[PDB]
Amino acid sequence: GIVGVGIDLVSIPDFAEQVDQPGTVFAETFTPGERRDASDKSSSAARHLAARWAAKEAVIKAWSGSRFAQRPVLPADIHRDIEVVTDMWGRPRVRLTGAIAEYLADVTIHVSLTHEGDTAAAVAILEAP
Amino acid sequence: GIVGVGIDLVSIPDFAEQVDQPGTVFAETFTPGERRDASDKSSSAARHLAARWAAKEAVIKAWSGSRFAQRPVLPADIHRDIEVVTDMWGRPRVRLTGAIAEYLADVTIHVSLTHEGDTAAAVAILEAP
Amino acid sequence: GIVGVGIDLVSIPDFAEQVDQPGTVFAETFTPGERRDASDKSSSAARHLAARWAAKEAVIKAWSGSRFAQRPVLPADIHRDIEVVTDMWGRPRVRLTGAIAEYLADVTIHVSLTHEGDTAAAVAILEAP
Ligand SMILES: [Br-]
Ligand SMILES: [Br-]
Ligand SMILES: [Br-]
Ligand SMILES: [Br-]
Ligand SMILES: [Br-]
Ligand SMILES: [Br-]
Ligand SMILES: [Br-]
Ligand SMILES: [Br-]
Ligand SMILES: [Br-]
Ligand SMILES: [Cl-]
Ligand SMILES: [Cl-]
Ligand SMILES: [Cl-]
Ligand SMILES: [Cl-]
Ligand SMILES: [Cl-]
Ligand SMILES: [Cl-]
Ligand SMILES: [Cl-]
Ligand SMILES: [Cl-]
Ligand SMILES: [Cl-]
Ligand SMILES: [Cl-]
Ligand SMILES: [Cl-]
Ligand SMILES: [Cl-]
Ligand SMILES: [Cl-]
Ligand SMILES: [Cl-]
Ligand SMILES: [Cl-]
Ligand SMILES: [Cl-]
Ligand SMILES: [Cl-]
Ligand SMILES: [Cl-]
Ligand SMILES: [Cl-]
Ligand code: NA
Ligand code: NA
Ligand code: NA
Ligand code: NA
Ligand code: NA
Ligand code: NA
């Protein structure tokens, strides 16, 4: 059964403008090299990191959206609890830590990432038996 | 003096439908046996656990409602910080952990639980000298 | 560059009425002596602690306001992660702990506190290179 669905679009130029700025959440998610590389809006790193950010948001949307009219239970640092990793061929998967890992124990997170020009996007479908 | 008041109603059938499903907060509050037993909407466990859930919500309401127009300070995992225990005769009391235990140090939590047919309910009155 | 700006006003009488009451966040920020002293609305402690509270709120406003249309990431216990200390001559500065310390690494927090009659106020300007 489907637990939740989420989609997110990210402006790659806006992302690049912010990703290496002090006073943002991004140090908690990304390395200083990643953040420096991603601060150029036409780089590989910007495109890829923006799509990773998109994927985190799509997961958060997918789970939160499953709890209509319920007080939120996602921790304030949720962005650093959801990691998008890739295998050697670039296939993505989501790794979790903290409370969300316990909430989504026994749930499969299907994710896909894409980018084009100034736009990155991701979709997440949460599925459980 | 009264610090806060809260009341919550819970649909026992809706509760039973959700309590043992993956992708919910319930594993953090309830044991797998409790969750399995409570997944039948006409069982003892469903009625009792639904009323416990109701009591957690009534406590949260009672305290949050005391802070009108203030940014919330309840942690995301607040549901697992409030436990409803009973003595050998079924009398309920509330046990706290985390920040809410510190906030409600020196406050007495008066609680009552009830159920009937497809409905559980609880009321909480927080009192302090 | 400016990361954020915040301003807060605090009613010193309302603050004094609440600061030493059970069932409030204040034990986490202030000592029992501070809280007892500050519970008289015409005392030095009330005026000073109200302005410290104002400063915490101004910092929170300054940073949160920098994230228009973004899900909040400040932890529920944010008030106890922001401390206003003073040097021997009463000049204030802000000390941080927890996630906000990481978010505001490399950001300078300029703060000022004031009080008059029944009103305390503070302003925070967050600046980053
Ligand atoms: Br949520
Ligand atoms: Br974070
Ligand atoms: Br990531
Ligand atoms: Br609250
Ligand atoms: Br929880
Ligand atoms: Br419980
Ligand atoms: Br925020
Ligand atoms: Br706090
Ligand atoms: Br302080
Ligand atoms: Cl959006
Ligand atoms: Cl964007
Ligand atoms: Cl940010
Ligand atoms: Cl970094
Ligand atoms: Cl591999
Ligand atoms: Cl993909
Ligand atoms: Cl309700
Ligand atoms: Cl319900
Ligand atoms: Cl849930
Ligand atoms: Cl369980
Ligand atoms: Cl007993
Ligand atoms: Cl009772
Ligand atoms: Cl305000
Ligand atoms: Cl006020
Ligand atoms: Cl409070
Ligand atoms: Cl105290
Ligand atoms: Cl939180
Ligand atoms: Cl000094
Ligand atoms: Cl000053
Ligand atoms: Na997939
Ligand atoms: Na996929
Ligand atoms: Na009672
Ligand atoms: Na009772
Ligand atoms: Na300054
Ligand atoms: Na100053």
Short mmCIF file of C-alpha atoms and ligand atoms in Angstrom, two decimals:
data_model
loop_
_atom_site.label_atom_id
_atom_site.label_comp_id
_atom_site.label_asym_id
_atom_site.label_seq_id
_atom_site.Cartn_x
_atom_site.Cartn_y
_atom_site.Cartn_z
CA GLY A 1 0.00 0.00 0.00
CA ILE A 2 1.01 3.62 -0.56
CA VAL A 3 1.84 5.52 2.66
CA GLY A 4 2.57 8.82 0.96
CA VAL A 5 3.64 10.72 -2.17
CA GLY A 6 5.76 13.84 -2.51
CA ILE A 7 7.18 15.99 -5.25
CA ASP A 8 9.57 18.96 -5.05
CA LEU A 9 11.04 21.41 -7.54
CA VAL A 10 14.20 23.39 -6.74
CA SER A 11 15.55 26.44 -8.62
CA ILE A 12 19.15 25.51 -9.28
CA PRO A 13 20.30 29.18 -9.49
CA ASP A 14 18.51 30.06 -6.20
CA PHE A 15 19.96 26.91 -4.61
CA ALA A 16 23.47 27.74 -5.79
CA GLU A 17 23.12 31.33 -4.50
CA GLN A 18 22.29 30.03 -0.99
CA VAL A 19 24.07 26.69 -0.55
CA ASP A 20 27.44 28.05 0.60
CA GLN A 21 26.18 31.11 2.50
CA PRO A 22 26.60 31.36 6.21
CA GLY A 23 23.34 31.39 8.18
CA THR A 24 21.66 28.53 6.27
CA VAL A 25 20.84 24.89 7.12
CA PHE A 26 23.14 23.58 4.39
CA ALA A 27 26.36 22.89 6.36
CA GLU A 28 24.42 20.15 8.19
CA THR A 29 23.57 18.35 5.02
CA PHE A 30 26.51 19.07 2.70
CA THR A 31 30.34 19.11 2.93
CA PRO A 32 32.28 22.39 2.52
CA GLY A 33 33.66 21.17 -0.82
CA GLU A 34 30.18 20.14 -1.98
CA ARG A 35 28.82 23.53 -0.85
CA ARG A 36 31.68 25.43 -2.55
CA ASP A 37 31.33 23.45 -5.79
CA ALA A 38 27.54 23.80 -5.74
CA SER A 39 27.76 27.60 -5.34
CA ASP A 40 28.34 27.89 -9.16
CA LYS A 41 24.85 27.61 -10.71
CA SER A 42 26.07 26.00 -13.97
CA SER A 43 28.27 23.31 -12.30
CA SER A 44 27.66 19.55 -11.99
CA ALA A 45 27.68 19.85 -8.21
CA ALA A 46 24.90 22.48 -8.21
CA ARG A 47 22.64 20.39 -10.41
CA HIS A 48 23.25 17.20 -8.36
CA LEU A 49 23.00 18.77 -4.89
CA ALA A 50 19.85 20.71 -5.88
CA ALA A 51 18.27 17.37 -6.92
CA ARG A 52 19.36 15.82 -3.61
CA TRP A 53 17.76 18.74 -1.78
CA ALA A 54 14.63 18.21 -3.89
CA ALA A 55 14.60 14.54 -2.86
CA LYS A 56 14.82 15.35 0.86
CA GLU A 57 11.85 17.71 0.48
CA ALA A 58 9.87 15.14 -1.54
CA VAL A 59 10.37 12.55 1.26
CA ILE A 60 9.30 15.07 3.91
CA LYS A 61 6.25 15.96 1.85
CA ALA A 62 5.41 12.30 1.26
CA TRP A 63 5.40 11.45 4.95
CA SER A 64 3.95 14.70 6.36
CA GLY A 65 1.21 14.61 3.74
CA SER A 66 0.12 11.21 5.06
CA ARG A 67 -0.88 12.92 8.36
CA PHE A 68 -3.56 15.38 7.31
CA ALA A 69 -4.97 17.36 10.31
CA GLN A 70 -2.38 15.85 12.72
CA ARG A 71 0.18 17.88 14.70
CA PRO A 72 3.53 17.55 12.95
CA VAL A 73 6.04 15.12 14.41
CA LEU A 74 9.03 15.76 12.15
CA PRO A 75 12.01 17.03 14.12
CA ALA A 76 13.36 20.51 13.41
CA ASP A 77 16.62 18.95 12.02
CA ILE A 78 14.76 16.60 9.67
CA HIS A 79 16.82 17.75 6.64
CA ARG A 80 19.96 16.24 8.08
CA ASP A 81 18.15 12.98 8.95
CA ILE A 82 17.36 12.15 5.32
CA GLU A 83 20.34 11.36 3.08
CA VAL A 84 20.25 10.64 -0.63
CA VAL A 85 23.06 8.31 -1.60
CA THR A 86 23.84 6.88 -5.00
CA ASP A 87 25.33 3.60 -6.14
CA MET A 88 28.26 3.48 -8.56
CA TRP A 89 25.86 3.93 -11.51
CA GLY A 90 24.04 6.94 -10.04
CA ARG A 91 20.91 5.18 -8.83
CA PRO A 92 19.56 6.98 -5.80
CA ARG A 93 18.36 5.65 -2.46
CA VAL A 94 17.30 7.28 0.76
CA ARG A 95 18.95 6.62 4.10
CA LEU A 96 17.30 7.72 7.37
CA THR A 97 18.36 8.49 10.94
CA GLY A 98 16.54 9.66 14.07
CA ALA A 99 12.82 9.38 14.72
CA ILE A 100 11.95 9.27 11.02
CA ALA A 101 13.96 6.07 10.64
CA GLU A 102 11.75 4.52 13.32
CA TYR A 103 8.56 5.91 11.83
CA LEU A 104 9.47 4.61 8.40
CA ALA A 105 10.81 1.26 9.59
CA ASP A 106 9.08 -1.30 7.34
CA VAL A 107 8.36 1.34 4.67
CA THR A 108 10.11 1.33 1.28
CA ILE A 109 11.12 4.78 -0.05
CA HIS A 110 11.01 4.85 -3.85
CA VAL A 111 12.71 7.99 -5.14
CA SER A 112 13.73 9.57 -8.45
CA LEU A 113 15.77 12.70 -9.18
CA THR A 114 16.02 14.77 -12.32
CA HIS A 115 17.36 18.10 -13.53
CA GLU A 116 17.23 20.23 -16.62
CA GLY A 117 18.46 23.76 -17.21
CA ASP A 118 17.65 25.82 -14.13
CA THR A 119 15.40 23.17 -12.50
CA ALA A 120 15.90 20.10 -10.33
CA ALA A 121 13.01 17.89 -9.23
CA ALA A 122 12.40 14.72 -7.27
CA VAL A 123 9.50 12.42 -6.49
CA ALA A 124 9.15 10.07 -3.50
CA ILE A 125 6.61 7.32 -3.08
CA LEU A 126 6.48 5.64 0.34
CA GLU A 127 5.17 2.05 0.21
CA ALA A 128 4.40 -0.45 3.01
CA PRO A 129 3.03 -3.95 3.11
CA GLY B 1 -4.35 27.34 40.15
CA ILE B 2 -5.25 25.82 36.79
CA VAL B 3 -2.39 25.86 34.25
CA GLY B 4 -4.37 24.27 31.44
CA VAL B 5 -7.27 22.06 30.34
CA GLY B 6 -7.51 19.62 27.45
CA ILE B 7 -9.99 17.18 26.02
CA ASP B 8 -9.60 14.66 23.17
CA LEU B 9 -11.89 12.22 21.40
CA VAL B 10 -10.50 9.29 19.41
CA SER B 11 -12.39 7.08 16.92
CA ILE B 12 -11.61 3.58 18.10
CA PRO B 13 -12.16 2.03 14.62
CA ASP B 14 -9.90 4.66 12.95
CA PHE B 15 -7.32 4.15 15.72
CA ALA B 16 -7.41 0.38 15.31
CA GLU B 17 -7.05 0.72 11.50
CA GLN B 18 -3.83 2.77 11.95
CA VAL B 19 -2.17 1.59 15.17
CA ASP B 20 -0.25 -1.37 13.71
CA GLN B 21 0.46 0.09 10.26
CA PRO B 22 3.97 0.85 9.20
CA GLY B 23 4.70 4.54 8.61
CA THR B 24 2.94 5.82 11.76
CA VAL B 25 4.18 7.26 15.09
CA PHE B 26 2.70 4.37 17.05
CA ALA B 27 5.72 2.04 17.41
CA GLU B 28 7.31 4.74 19.59
CA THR B 29 4.47 4.73 22.03
CA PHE B 30 3.17 1.15 21.95
CA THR B 31 4.65 -2.39 22.00
CA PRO B 32 4.26 -4.71 18.98
CA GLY B 33 1.89 -6.93 20.96
CA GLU B 34 -0.13 -3.91 22.09
CA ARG B 35 -0.23 -2.64 18.50
CA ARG B 36 -1.22 -6.08 17.13
CA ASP B 37 -3.93 -6.56 19.77
CA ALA B 38 -5.21 -3.01 19.28
CA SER B 39 -5.53 -3.50 15.49
CA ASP B 40 -8.92 -5.29 16.10
CA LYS B 41 -11.45 -2.47 16.59
CA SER B 42 -13.73 -4.48 18.93
CA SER B 43 -10.92 -5.72 21.26
CA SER B 44 -10.08 -4.65 24.83
CA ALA B 45 -6.66 -3.49 23.69
CA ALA B 46 -8.11 -1.16 21.02
CA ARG B 47 -10.46 0.49 23.47
CA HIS B 48 -7.74 0.92 26.14
CA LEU B 49 -4.93 2.08 23.83
CA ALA B 50 -7.28 4.52 22.04
CA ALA B 51 -8.10 6.05 25.47
CA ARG B 52 -4.38 6.24 26.27
CA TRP B 53 -3.81 8.01 22.96
CA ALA B 54 -6.69 10.35 23.83
CA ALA B 55 -5.02 11.10 27.18
CA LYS B 56 -1.69 11.99 25.56
CA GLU B 57 -3.49 14.41 23.24
CA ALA B 58 -5.50 15.91 26.12
CA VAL B 59 -2.24 16.61 28.03
CA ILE B 60 -0.66 18.19 24.94
CA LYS B 61 -3.75 20.31 24.43
CA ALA B 62 -3.84 21.31 28.09
CA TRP B 63 -0.28 22.58 28.09
CA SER B 64 -0.11 24.04 24.56
CA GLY B 65 -3.42 25.80 25.13
CA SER B 66 -1.88 27.62 28.10
CA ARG B 67 0.48 29.43 25.66
CA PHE B 68 -1.87 31.34 23.41
CA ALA B 69 0.02 33.41 20.75
CA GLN B 70 3.41 31.89 21.78
CA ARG B 71 5.68 29.89 19.45
CA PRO B 72 5.25 26.22 20.29
CA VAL B 73 7.92 24.59 22.41
CA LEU B 74 6.71 20.98 22.41
CA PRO B 75 9.26 18.66 20.84
CA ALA B 76 8.36 16.78 17.66
CA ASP B 77 8.48 13.44 19.61
CA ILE B 78 6.16 14.70 22.36
CA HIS B 79 3.83 11.68 22.00
CA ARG B 80 6.50 9.33 23.26
CA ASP B 81 7.36 11.67 26.18
CA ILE B 82 3.92 11.35 27.77
CA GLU B 83 3.00 7.92 29.15
CA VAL B 84 -0.30 6.91 30.68
CA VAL B 85 0.21 4.21 33.27
CA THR B 86 -2.38 2.55 35.45
CA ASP B 87 -2.27 1.14 38.96
CA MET B 88 -3.51 -2.38 39.73
CA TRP B 89 -7.12 -1.09 39.86
CA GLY B 90 -6.97 0.75 36.54
CA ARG B 91 -6.55 4.27 37.87
CA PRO B 92 -4.56 6.31 35.38
CA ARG B 93 -1.62 8.65 35.88
CA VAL B 94 0.67 10.49 33.53
CA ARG B 95 4.43 10.07 33.49
CA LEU B 96 6.67 12.54 31.61
CA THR B 97 10.16 12.60 30.11
CA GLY B 98 12.20 15.17 28.20
CA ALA B 99 11.61 18.91 28.19
CA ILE B 100 7.94 18.58 29.09
CA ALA B 101 8.90 16.91 32.36
CA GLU B 102 10.94 20.01 33.20
CA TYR B 103 8.23 22.39 32.06
CA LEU B 104 5.63 20.58 34.13
CA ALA B 105 7.84 20.07 37.18
CA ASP B 106 5.71 21.26 40.11
CA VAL B 107 2.47 20.80 38.10
CA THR B 108 -0.06 18.08 38.94
CA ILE B 109 -1.64 16.33 35.92
CA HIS B 110 -5.20 15.22 36.70
CA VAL B 111 -6.44 12.87 33.99
CA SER B 112 -9.47 10.68 33.24
CA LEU B 113 -10.08 8.19 30.43
CA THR B 114 -13.31 6.73 29.13
CA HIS B 115 -14.65 4.73 26.21
CA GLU B 116 -17.96 3.64 24.82
CA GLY B 117 -18.80 1.91 21.57
CA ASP B 118 -16.64 3.43 18.84
CA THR B 119 -15.37 6.35 20.96
CA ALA B 120 -12.58 6.90 23.48
CA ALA B 121 -12.09 10.21 25.28
CA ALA B 122 -9.86 11.75 27.91
CA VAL B 123 -9.64 14.98 29.87
CA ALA B 124 -6.53 16.52 31.47
CA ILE B 125 -6.45 19.34 33.96
CA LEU B 126 -3.00 20.73 34.82
CA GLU B 127 -2.84 22.32 38.30
CA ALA B 128 -0.02 24.20 40.08
CA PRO B 129 0.32 25.90 43.42
CA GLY C 1 25.73 41.21 4.35
CA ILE C 2 22.64 41.15 6.55
CA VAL C 3 21.24 37.65 7.20
CA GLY C 4 18.31 38.80 9.30
CA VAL C 5 16.77 41.42 11.59
CA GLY C 6 14.52 40.99 14.61
CA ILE C 7 12.86 43.15 17.22
CA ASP C 8 10.87 42.14 20.32
CA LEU C 9 8.96 44.01 23.01
CA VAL C 10 8.18 42.39 26.36
CA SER C 11 5.69 43.61 29.01
CA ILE C 12 7.74 43.63 32.17
CA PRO C 13 4.66 43.22 34.44
CA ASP C 14 3.35 40.27 32.34
CA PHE C 15 6.87 38.78 32.31
CA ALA C 16 7.21 39.14 36.07
CA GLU C 17 3.76 37.56 36.61
CA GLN C 18 4.83 34.44 34.63
CA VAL C 19 8.59 34.03 35.11
CA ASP C 20 8.48 32.08 38.40
CA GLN C 21 5.24 30.16 37.78
CA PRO C 22 5.28 26.43 37.41
CA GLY C 23 4.25 25.16 33.97
CA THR C 24 6.30 27.67 31.95
CA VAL C 25 9.50 27.40 29.85
CA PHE C 26 11.39 29.74 32.16
CA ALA C 27 13.19 27.25 34.47
CA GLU C 28 15.19 26.15 31.40
CA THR C 29 16.49 29.61 30.76
CA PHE C 30 16.71 31.20 34.22
CA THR C 31 17.95 30.21 37.71
CA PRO C 32 15.50 29.86 40.63
CA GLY C 33 16.98 32.97 42.26
CA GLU C 34 16.74 34.90 38.99
CA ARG C 35 13.15 33.72 38.56
CA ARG C 36 12.24 34.59 42.18
CA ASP C 37 13.87 38.03 41.96
CA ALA C 38 12.28 38.70 38.56
CA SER C 39 8.78 37.85 39.88
CA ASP C 40 8.57 41.43 41.36
CA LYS C 41 7.61 43.66 38.41
CA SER C 42 9.41 46.77 39.76
CA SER C 43 12.74 44.99 40.55
CA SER C 44 16.10 45.22 38.73
CA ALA C 45 15.96 41.51 37.99
CA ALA C 46 12.55 41.78 36.27
CA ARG C 47 13.69 44.59 34.02
CA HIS C 48 16.97 42.82 33.10
CA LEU C 49 15.54 39.32 32.59
CA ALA C 50 12.62 40.71 30.53
CA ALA C 51 15.21 42.40 28.25
CA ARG C 52 17.15 39.13 28.02
CA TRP C 53 13.94 37.35 27.06
CA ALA C 54 13.31 40.09 24.48
CA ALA C 55 16.80 39.49 23.05
CA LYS C 56 16.24 35.74 22.68
CA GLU C 57 13.02 36.44 20.77
CA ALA C 58 14.70 39.09 18.59
CA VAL C 59 17.41 36.54 17.60
CA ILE C 60 14.78 33.90 16.82
CA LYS C 61 12.85 36.42 14.75
CA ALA C 62 15.99 37.55 12.95
CA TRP C 63 16.93 34.06 11.85
CA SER C 64 13.43 32.62 11.22
CA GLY C 65 12.51 35.74 9.26
CA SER C 66 15.39 35.03 6.88
CA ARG C 67 13.57 31.83 5.75
CA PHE C 68 10.33 33.13 4.31
CA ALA C 69 8.10 30.27 2.97
CA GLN C 70 10.48 27.57 4.33
CA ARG C 71 9.49 24.91 6.89
CA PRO C 72 10.85 25.98 10.26
CA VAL C 73 14.03 24.32 11.47
CA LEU C 74 14.34 25.85 14.94
CA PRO C 75 14.21 23.20 17.64
CA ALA C 76 11.36 23.24 20.15
CA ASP C 77 13.86 24.11 22.98
CA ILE C 78 15.37 27.03 21.04
CA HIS C 79 14.86 29.45 23.98
CA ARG C 80 17.39 27.58 26.08
CA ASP C 81 19.89 27.45 23.18
CA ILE C 82 20.27 31.23 23.00
CA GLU C 83 21.92 32.91 26.00
CA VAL C 84 22.43 36.61 26.53
CA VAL C 85 25.53 37.24 28.59
CA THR C 86 27.01 40.56 29.62
CA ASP C 87 30.56 41.72 30.21
CA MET C 88 31.56 43.51 33.42
CA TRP C 89 30.23 46.82 32.00
CA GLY C 90 26.84 45.42 30.96
CA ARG C 91 27.50 45.06 27.25
CA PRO C 92 25.47 42.18 25.89
CA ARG C 93 26.44 39.32 23.61
CA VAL C 94 24.67 36.21 22.43
CA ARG C 95 25.97 32.70 22.98
CA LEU C 96 24.49 29.73 21.09
CA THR C 97 24.26 25.96 21.50
CA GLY C 98 22.67 23.15 19.50
CA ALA C 99 21.71 23.29 15.83
CA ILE C 100 21.38 27.07 15.82
CA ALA C 101 25.06 27.39 16.75
CA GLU C 102 25.88 25.40 13.62
CA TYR C 103 23.45 27.33 11.45
CA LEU C 104 24.85 30.63 12.65
CA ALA C 105 28.50 29.57 12.55
CA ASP C 106 30.26 32.38 10.65
CA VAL C 107 27.42 34.84 11.43
CA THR C 108 27.90 37.79 13.80
CA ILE C 109 24.93 38.51 16.12
CA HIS C 110 24.69 42.23 16.89
CA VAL C 111 22.25 42.80 19.75
CA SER C 112 20.98 45.65 21.94
CA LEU C 113 18.69 45.61 24.97
CA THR C 114 16.70 48.39 26.57
CA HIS C 115 13.97 48.94 29.12
CA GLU C 116 11.81 51.74 30.37
CA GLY C 117 8.87 51.69 32.76
CA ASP C 118 6.78 48.63 31.97
CA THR C 119 8.57 47.78 28.70
CA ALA C 120 11.71 45.90 27.70
CA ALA C 121 12.88 45.64 24.09
CA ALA C 122 15.73 44.21 22.08
CA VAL C 123 16.96 44.28 18.50
CA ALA C 124 19.17 41.68 16.76
CA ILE C 125 20.93 42.09 13.46
CA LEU C 126 22.59 38.96 12.04
CA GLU C 127 25.53 39.75 9.71
CA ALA C 128 27.74 37.45 7.58
CA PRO C 129 30.58 38.00 5.19
BR BR D 1 4.40 15.28 10.23
BR BR D 2 19.22 20.39 9.42
BR BR D 3 21.52 14.33 0.81
BR BR D 4 3.49 24.78 23.14
BR BR D 5 6.67 10.01 18.89
BR BR D 6 0.71 5.77 26.81
BR BR D 7 13.18 28.70 10.96
BR BR D 8 13.28 25.97 26.41
BR BR D 9 19.44 34.55 28.54
CL CL D 10 7.09 23.59 -2.37
CL CL D 11 13.85 26.69 -5.02
CL CL D 12 18.25 28.02 5.18
CL CL D 13 29.85 23.03 5.05
CL CL D 14 27.62 0.29 -5.95
CL CL D 15 16.48 8.53 -10.72
CL CL D 16 -8.88 17.35 17.98
CL CL D 17 -9.69 9.80 15.80
CL CL D 18 0.90 8.75 12.38
CL CL D 19 5.65 -1.68 17.70
CL CL D 20 -0.67 -0.60 42.22
CL CL D 21 -10.44 7.49 34.87
CL CL D 22 5.79 39.53 18.90
CL CL D 23 5.02 40.42 26.70
CL CL D 24 5.61 29.47 28.89
CL CL D 25 14.18 27.82 38.02
CL CL D 26 11.79 19.65 17.52
CL CL D 27 34.44 41.44 31.23
CL CL D 28 22.80 47.42 24.64
NA NA D 29 12.66 3.24 -7.09
NA NA D 30 13.74 5.23 -8.45
NA NA D 31 -7.30 12.82 39.06
NA NA D 32 -8.60 11.15 37.46
NA NA D 33 26.64 45.22 18.63
NA NA D 34 25.07 46.12 20.57
#
